[PDB]
Design a protein around this ligand. Sequence first.
Ligand SMILES: *[C@H](C)[C@H]1/C(=C/c2[nH]c(/C=C3N=C(/C=C4\NC(=O)C(CC)=C4C)C(C)=C\3CCC(=O)O)c(CCC(=O)O)c2C)NC(=O)[C@@H]1C
Ligand SMILES: CCC1=C(C)/C(=C/C2=NC(=C\c3[nH]c(/C=C4\NC(=O)[C@H](C)[C@H]4CC)c(C)c3CCC(=O)O)/C(CCC(=O)O)=C2C)NC1=O
Ligand SMILES: CCC1=C(C)/C(=C/C2=NC(=C\c3[nH]c(/C=C4\NC(=O)[C@H](C)[C@H]4CC)c(C)c3CCC(=O)O)/C(CCC(=O)O)=C2C)NC1=O
Ligand SMILES: CCC1=C(C)/C(=C/C2=NC(=C\c3[nH]c(/C=C4\NC(=O)[C@H](C)[C@H]4CC)c(C)c3CCC(=O)O)/C(CCC(=O)O)=C2C)NC1=O
Ligand SMILES: CCC1=C(C)/C(=C/C2=NC(=C\c3[nH]c(/C=C4\NC(=O)[C@H](C)[C@H]4CC)c(C)c3CCC(=O)O)/C(CCC(=O)O)=C2C)NC1=O
Ligand SMILES: CCC1=C(C)/C(=C/C2=NC(=C\c3[nH]c(/C=C4\NC(=O)[C@H](C)[C@H]4CC)c(C)c3CCC(=O)O)/C(CCC(=O)O)=C2C)NC1=O
Ligand SMILES: CCC1=C(C)/C(=C/C2=NC(=C\c3[nH]c(/C=C4\NC(=O)[C@H](C)[C@H]4CC)c(C)c3CCC(=O)O)/C(CCC(=O)O)=C2C)NC1=O
Ligand SMILES: CCC1=C(C)/C(=C/C2=NC(=C\c3[nH]c(/C=C4\NC(=O)[C@H](C)[C@H]4CC)c(C)c3CCC(=O)O)/C(CCC(=O)O)=C2C)NC1=O
Lengths: 169, 160, 160, 160, 160, 160, 49, 161, 161, 161, 161
Amino acid sequence: MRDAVTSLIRNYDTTGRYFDRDAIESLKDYFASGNDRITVAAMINSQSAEIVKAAANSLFEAVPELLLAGGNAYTTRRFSACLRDMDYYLRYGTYALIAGDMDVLNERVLQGLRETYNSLGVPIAPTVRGIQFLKDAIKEMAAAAGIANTAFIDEPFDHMTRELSEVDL
Amino acid sequence: SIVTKSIVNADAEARYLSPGELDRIKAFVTSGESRLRIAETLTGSRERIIKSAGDALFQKRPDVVSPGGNAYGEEMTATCLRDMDYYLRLITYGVVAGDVTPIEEIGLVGVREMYKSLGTPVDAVAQAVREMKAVATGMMSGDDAAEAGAYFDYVIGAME
Amino acid sequence: SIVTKSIVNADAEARYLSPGELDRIKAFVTSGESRLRIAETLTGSRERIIKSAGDALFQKRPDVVSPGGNAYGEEMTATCLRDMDYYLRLITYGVVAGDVTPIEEIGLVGVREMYKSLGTPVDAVAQAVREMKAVATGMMSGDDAAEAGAYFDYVIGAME
Amino acid sequence: SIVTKSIVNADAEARYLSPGELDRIKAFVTSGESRLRIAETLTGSRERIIKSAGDALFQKRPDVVSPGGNAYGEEMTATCLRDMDYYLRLITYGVVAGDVTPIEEIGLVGVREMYKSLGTPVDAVAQAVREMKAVATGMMSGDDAAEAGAYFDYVIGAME
Amino acid sequence: SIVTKSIVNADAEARYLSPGELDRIKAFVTSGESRLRIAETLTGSRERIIKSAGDALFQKRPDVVSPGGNAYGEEMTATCLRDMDYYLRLITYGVVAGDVTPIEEIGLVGVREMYKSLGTPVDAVAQAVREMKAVATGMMSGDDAAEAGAYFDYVIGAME
Amino acid sequence: SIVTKSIVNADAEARYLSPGELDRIKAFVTSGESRLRIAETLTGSRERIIKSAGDALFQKRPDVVSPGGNAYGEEMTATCLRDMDYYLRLITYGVVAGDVTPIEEIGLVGVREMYKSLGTPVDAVAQAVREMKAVATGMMSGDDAAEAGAYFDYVIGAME
Amino acid sequence: AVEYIHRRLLGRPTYGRQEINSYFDTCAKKGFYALVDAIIDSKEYEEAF
Amino acid sequence: MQDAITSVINSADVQGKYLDGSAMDKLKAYFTTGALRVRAASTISANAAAIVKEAVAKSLLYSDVTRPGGNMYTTRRYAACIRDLDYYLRYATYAMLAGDPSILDERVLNGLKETYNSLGVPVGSTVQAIQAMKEVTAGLVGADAGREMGVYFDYICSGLS
Amino acid sequence: MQDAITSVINSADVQGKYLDGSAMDKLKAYFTTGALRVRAASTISANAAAIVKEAVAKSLLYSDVTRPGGNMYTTRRYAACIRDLDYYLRYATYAMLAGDPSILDERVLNGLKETYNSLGVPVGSTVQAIQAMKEVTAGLVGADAGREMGVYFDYICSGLS
Amino acid sequence: MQDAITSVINSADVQGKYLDGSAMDKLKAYFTTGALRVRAASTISANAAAIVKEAVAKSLLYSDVTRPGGNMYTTRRYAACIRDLDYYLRYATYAMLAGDPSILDERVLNGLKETYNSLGVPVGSTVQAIQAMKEVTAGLVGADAGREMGVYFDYICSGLS
Amino acid sequence: MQDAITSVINSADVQGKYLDGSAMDKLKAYFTTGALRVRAASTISANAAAIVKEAVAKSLLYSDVTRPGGNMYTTRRYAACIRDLDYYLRYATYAMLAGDPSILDERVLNGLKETYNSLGVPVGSTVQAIQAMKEVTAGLVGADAGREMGVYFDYICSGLS
Ligand SMILES: *[C@H](C)[C@H]1/C(=C/c2[nH]c(/C=C3N=C(/C=C4\NC(=O)C(CC)=C4C)C(C)=C\3CCC(=O)O)c(CCC(=O)O)c2C)NC(=O)[C@@H]1C
Ligand SMILES: CCC1=C(C)/C(=C/C2=NC(=C\c3[nH]c(/C=C4\NC(=O)[C@H](C)[C@H]4CC)c(C)c3CCC(=O)O)/C(CCC(=O)O)=C2C)NC1=O
Ligand SMILES: CCC1=C(C)/C(=C/C2=NC(=C\c3[nH]c(/C=C4\NC(=O)[C@H](C)[C@H]4CC)c(C)c3CCC(=O)O)/C(CCC(=O)O)=C2C)NC1=O
Ligand SMILES: CCC1=C(C)/C(=C/C2=NC(=C\c3[nH]c(/C=C4\NC(=O)[C@H](C)[C@H]4CC)c(C)c3CCC(=O)O)/C(CCC(=O)O)=C2C)NC1=O
Ligand SMILES: CCC1=C(C)/C(=C/C2=NC(=C\c3[nH]c(/C=C4\NC(=O)[C@H](C)[C@H]4CC)c(C)c3CCC(=O)O)/C(CCC(=O)O)=C2C)NC1=O
Ligand SMILES: CCC1=C(C)/C(=C/C2=NC(=C\c3[nH]c(/C=C4\NC(=O)[C@H](C)[C@H]4CC)c(C)c3CCC(=O)O)/C(CCC(=O)O)=C2C)NC1=O
Ligand SMILES: CCC1=C(C)/C(=C/C2=NC(=C\c3[nH]c(/C=C4\NC(=O)[C@H](C)[C@H]4CC)c(C)c3CCC(=O)O)/C(CCC(=O)O)=C2C)NC1=O
Ligand SMILES: CCC1=C(C)/C(=C/C2=NC(=C\c3[nH]c(/C=C4\NC(=O)[C@H](C)[C@H]4CC)c(C)c3CCC(=O)O)/C(CCC(=O)O)=C2C)NC1=O
């Protein structure tokens, strides 16, 4: 896995150069916003099982077929599998919120997710809309808790739904 | 780094980050300023560190520069100082990252196999990092010398 | 968009962007504010556009809602208004992007094959976009109506 | 006919006609009386077939005879029955030819393009030839109905 | 076969099987019983066909069995009768399949290159198949002799 | 000749003649007397060469003179010797040309097709030109025999 | 078959997906004869040969 | 690419034997079923677009795959899906006429799994679409012609899965 | 490219009428000729090489053409001559099968005249060879089909001259 | 191939949602940086050959790779090296204008590693050449335009390594 | 996995024939060369690490691949490179002892190209490393033992390329 620091370290290592002015400025930029990420992560660790359920109910209010007959969140086995999947998305979104880099999401979530979902019949679309219902919930909850900047909260879910995304453009 | 190690250690355990690990990440996040100061101290004076450490090494272990040793000749001594420069760069990376996974994960895993394939005595390389540690901790304040000497200590420990 | 088209057209030619293409991108960058205003005008009043355009379409072409036509019944008329909503959304995308490559690259390439496989008259769909254009250019100022009617014009032209 | 198609096949393969397709031409030669009887019965009752098939088509799909539809009015319905006359005429030509190629040359190349120009729904024409097929095979004996229904089936397959 | 040829010829044209090709396959399907009877006639009396045809060939073309020819000696004459047996077997395959694509696709493509590399006169092989055709069409009824002589005719035609 | 071939080579490559092939034409010009001597000796003893080579061919391959073979009878054997006369004539033309191209233009393009028509075994003709080669190189001096045997070798190579 | 016929008649492999979605669409609605006709039509054939 | 006749001839030729009674019986079975194969092929050639659009109307319409995010979303993807289903029906008709599925694994099932896995095409949804196409054409041509169509439709679904 | 059937359909199509009884009369005339047309076509296809070799052995062999000084001297020109004769016989067989000489005017006699003037091919020797081939195929396949081949060979000669 | 605008639209479309405030803020960020992107693209289009030749003069000249045995030895290899560096600078300019590196891994970094590994091209030396090109163009266009050029130069070096 | 003896036996068994004189001559050739194979295998087992480190000192050292950015850069990559070269020398010794390269394409060259292409390993640089290993061991064991080592080294380089 990579955080932002090991990203800069691997970036400078492949050319064999030391840190310049700009590398120290980007490391200061990660270390200055570190406390903000950590109180956001602790506030998510407060209400994880609540946020996952609320994002799930907002997703099922969005796409109503999945609770109904032909949908994929049909039975309670499928309902519990979908809510555990949303718990996975919030967990690795917290991990990428603390790390500040998208390599944990790429190595442990997004690599080969589409294969499993296309095979099992799990749809990819309401998965993404549920991921960003989680993102919107986290964003307004942490903007309510005195935190000025929300770009780092914006980062990992936007990456996760740029990757599961179907490129049609 | 610290964040990578905490994330992976919570990741195998199928749990979130425990609050103790979270204040560990928080304390590392606060101490990053002193880490960057130690990194600028190590980066800006690399010429004198490599020069004085090579001088004290070849004073201490003269057989590797004598005919018959590995670092005998102009280009071989230049490659020897280049290897010392590599290890000082990895020391700076480990100082910034707050953990030795840059140093170990770049330049310490197959170091015995590589230096055995080159024909190099690894104890003399440990003496080179020892002289680098002496010059570097002679260059800083007390707690800064202790925090840099932790990573220098890890490199000499991972040699032997 | 404009930037994609300029980059690709310089990209095949193995050259950089010519300065005329660069002031084209600059003029599009300056006109983006008016493009976003037209997009908010089209986005905020989508209910009345879709409703009035469906009303004028079924007034104009009553056979597709008569028994025997495609959009006969409750759910079929709902799907018809949904297809009109899709095309108004693509109109908004083409208004923002400054070019018709969103509209063409999403909902105009195999439109003939799709609507032939569904059993749909494509001229009645062109009349639907015509009524959408009438309601939309009845909703704006002059130059705004011309700039939106360019993309509405492209959709009706790409139908037939 | 079958002879022109066998000749262009032996020409593109640059060889003489195989005894298999010589036997095919000979069997076609002997079955000339049966196909003459089929085309005779079809040329006999063309008006009754067209009237029953047109009323069955208008009963099935009323969108074409509705206001705003294609075949609205006396002359438009008469031209619709004229197009059904042309298609039954080509059906008789292909029935007496033993091949579908005169139907292809005269009335199957650009029917989608020209009906895209006139505004005629092509699936409605496929339904019209479906009703003509059902009525003509209702008139014939079952083996001859199978033969004529092969060519009718080919026409509705090339339609939709 | 016939079905392979019809499927491929409709397959390149991106269309289904035309109804004329379908009654071609149907007529071949009905004539398969007479094809199997001709095949049993050719299969059961292969000894007398090969023996009498070799006798009439060496009577007709004695130089290939004279010293200096290809089929001179015991094993060479045995290989000559074996090649005639191969061609009678391919004749039986082409009789069953209803087309010459077994015969051509097995034993007629590089027949000139093979028999030129062996040093064989190909006209004498054409005379061998001619005598095989004489003995075989002397063995059957009229239409059966014509249908088998079509494939024998194709083999002698593909020789020269 | 060599000059026409160098000219068509410089034409297809769209340049003037290189000094290498100018030196080739000059060396060909100086070696004209040797090739005149070779063609002189061949035009001298053509009957003896043809008689010994034809009897050697008939002794080697008796299939052509056997009953049922190609060259059976007085006129057929005389035409066989006439074809050997044509080939020795083209050998002399190519010997005096310095190139194999008049042999190619006059007697090497369609010899397989025309001998496929007449029924002549082409490998027997290759044996005939082999015997003509052996006899003519037996007559010549060894260096000139090598030159004439190059063209004879080319003819039997283009035969088989 | 699209790829090998393209390598035979144009002398190069295909570049991407559009190029293959466009030639196999000509193979779709019209067939192999129009595939050869569309490869021989192309501006790269005209400019190259 | 070989029908029942060419496969029987290939077996008897790889044996090197003449056509014995079992081969004669196999060819008699094919020559009895061939007229039914011809009539079913004509009936399927009649209603290609209707069978395809009824298969989409049964399975793929109004589900998530035609919604945003689905692989059948755009008009390009819809046209390519109709194109793929027309291919499956056309080659199932060819394999029905030949009486041998060699054309299916020669010319459909050759690189189809790797193509669909590289594009991101759902294989289960297209298997359900082919199954609905099979159900519609078996309702069209009857019981036994529908069965001899469904054996090659099941061959395509098995090679795709 | 038109048959007797396609020419009948074409003539009834230019004036614009349907099929009349006289068209059916021409069609039944074509069929009752067409059965023996098939058998004669199989006989000509069986023996084409012997027919061409007897044609050249009858007329062209011991003349100045197959000798030096003629246009049939070299093996290149001899192979081209045999190929020209094979093509005349094959297209005459196609015209015999179709019952219409439109193929001979369409594919054979299109530009054959001017290339025969430009290459210096003798028209008279070719016409003699075609007529020799005509009575060779007449003695082979029979009398009525001999007349059938006769008018199409004569069509080729009239387009040539 | 997508800029910042098309990627924002693609995210909002794969969601199926309308453009909310975060997308509006991202597009406002791009519409503020676009004029600086335009001016840096003009300044880079001014000095293509100068930036390339200064990158070779910094890194690759007078080293072993221009000596015999090096992969930049011959004039063909030198011309191909200048061509490759011009490609890297041109596509870095394109990715700077789009504000998204999708064109780089679509059209540069696609088969570049396997091509360079098959040819024998040193990847470290060309990474150092791209780094010197980045250093020269960041000296050319300033601090922040040099940084937004260097992010795509680092993208090319990371995908190459 | 088969030596010269097992391949000769497999050929005679797939024939179904007994061991004729050509098989006896092949086995006599192997039984004459076997002592030289044994002594060369002992001499190569003596100096495994020396041959490997001399191959790296000839080809891969002081080039770009041991510099930053190269695929042989880190200590992990250096150790894996020494491991890969030890594998090539060990399996070339095995194929020299067997007298048949079946073990090489069974157990080295099976998925090696796809592994190296997935990892980003340069194939030309490792082919040059195997060639230098061949040159060093042919200097070690002599002319003819070096040749019968180099035939399997060339087999590994040909299957890798
Ligand atoms: C829920 C909102 C959506 C949904 C979910 C759904 N998923 C499954 C089954 C599985 N999901 C996964 C997913 C992951 N595994 C991982 O390792 C990661 C990264 C951490 C993810 C995201 C896996 C592996 C399975 C298979 C079951 C298993 O874990 O062994 C189902 C069950 C499908 C079924 O019918 O069996 C469901 C319902 N479905 C929806 O409709 C929502 C959009
Ligand atoms: C086949 C057996 C089976 C059942 C029954 C089942 C039920 C089921 N009931 C649900 C919710 C619910 N069910 C109810 C109501 C009720 N629930 C009851 O059993 C009472 C009859 C009734 C109250 C009197 C309500 C109000 C919700 C919404 C809960 C929420 O907001 O999360 C949900 C969550 C998804 C949804 O909103 O529908 C499931 C999966 N799953 C199964 O596999
Ligand atoms: C960042 C992690 C890392 C390390 C450590 C590293 C070492 C490394 N050291 C090398 C050589 C060397 N390194 C030394 C160094 C020494 N010999 C002595 O006697 C002294 C004790 C000691 C240094 C103080 C010498 C002499 C050589 C040359 C060996 C030879 O030429 O055979 C080489 C081969 C040539 C080259 O490409 O540089 C590598 C790859 N590479 C790496 O990527
Ligand atoms: C964004 C680009 C895009 C378009 C255009 C699109 C169209 C689309 N239109 C459909 C149906 C339809 N669309 C119409 C629309 C019309 N019929 C009429 O008579 C009117 C003229 C016209 C609308 C005003 C109707 C009636 C259907 C239902 C067809 C059926 O049920 O057979 C369906 C199948 C059901 C579904 O999944 O929605 C698609 C995919 N999908 C897309 O992704
Ligand atoms: C099924 C298609 C097929 C054919 C035709 C075929 C022919 C074939 N004929 C051969 C030999 C031969 N075939 C002949 C036949 C003839 N020579 C004459 O003079 C007669 C005119 C004529 C037969 C009536 C002779 C003499 C040989 C031996 C050639 C030699 O020994 O050099 C051989 C080489 C030895 C062998 O393996 O049998 C092959 C492969 N193989 C095939 O798979
Ligand atoms: C200069 C290029 C050239 C060639 C090659 C050529 C060949 C040629 N060979 C002929 C005949 C012939 N050629 C042969 C020759 C042979 N058959 C055998 O038995 C022998 C093995 C072989 C002799 C090597 C025979 C037997 C005939 C007469 C064929 C017949 O009358 O059926 C004839 C027919 C008579 C004539 O018009 O002179 C020509 C034109 N003419 C040319 O102008
Ligand atoms: C003749 C043998 C053969 C087949 C079958 C074949 C399929 C094939 N289907 C494709 C795409 C496709 N196939 C589908 C089909 C589907 N996706 C869905 O969601 C549905 C479940 C399913 C339809 C029932 C779609 C939507 C695409 C377009 C993918 C895209 O544009 O991103 C592509 C990508 C390139 C292109 O569209 O033109 C190929 C090569 N190619 C062949 O040569
Ligand atoms: C399908 C209709 C069709 C025909 C008929 C046709 C004929 C045709 N005959 C040709 C030559 C020829 N045709 C002959 C003909 C003859 N030998 C004689 O002297 C006799 C008068 C006659 C033998 C019966 C000769 C000698 C040449 C070659 C003359 C030369 O170019 O050297 C050529 C020039 C290319 C070639 O060398 O073959 C064409 C195109 N092309 C066609 O597409």
